[PDB]
């Protein structure tokens, strides 16, 4: 899902639903928060 | 467009084939019956696998409709149907001008 583009970039949020199908569930799975506190 | 509510017009009913007084109301499409054959045929066709089986019209172009006036004879109590030209605003028995 992160592949492609003319620059290396995800292009959509890397946080993904808990119920996403396999193959779609990549990145940060069911994250309550992101970033460094 | 403004139309009165007590038009005198020809009634074709066999009781009085002449000019009688009519009440004027606006026609509205009746409630769709779930038992209509085309509806029963459509529901049988939609069941199962295959997705949408009939064309679903999208490209609307008209911004008006032909208003249909129901005319009720005050002797027979039978009805007549009459469509008028396309109008954006319509009312029956509004306030007269002047």
């Amino acid at each position: 899902p992160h592949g492609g583009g003319n620059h290396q970039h995800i292009g959509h949020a890397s946080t993904v639903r808990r119920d996403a199908p396999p193959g779609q569930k990549v990145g940060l799975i069911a994250a309550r928060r992101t970033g460094r506190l | 467009v403004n139309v009165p509510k007590t038009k005198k017009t020809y009634c074709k009913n066999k009781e009085c084939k002449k000019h009688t007084l009519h009440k004027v109301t606006q026609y509205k499409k009746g409630k769709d019956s779930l038992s209509a054959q085309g509806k029963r045929r459509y529901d049988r066709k939609q069941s199962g696998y295959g997705g949408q089986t009939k064309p679903v019209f999208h490209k609307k172009a008209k911004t008006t409709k032909k208003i249909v006036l129901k005319l009720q004879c005050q002797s027979c109590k039978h009805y007549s149907q009459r469509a008028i030209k396309r109008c954006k605003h319509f009312e029956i028995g509004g306030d007269k001008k002047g």
Binding site: P1, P22, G23 | -
Partner: protein, 52 residues
């Protein structure tokens, strides 16, 4: 598309764990009457390395 790498690990083909030089499962002795009611003495004979 094609099957992603995260999906291919569940088939366990080349993603099975490397266990050829492991010394066996590490776990307590099976619970029995002596342990349930008293004590049993064992002696430590080796302290060994387990790969992985």
């Amino acid at each position: 598309g094609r099957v992603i790498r995260a999906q291919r690990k569940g088939a366990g083909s080349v993603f099975k764990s490397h266990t050829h030089h492991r010394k066996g499962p590490a776990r307590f002795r099976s619970l029995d009457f002596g342990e349930r009611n008293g004590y049993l003495k064992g002696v430590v004979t080796d302290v060994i390395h387990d790969p992985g």
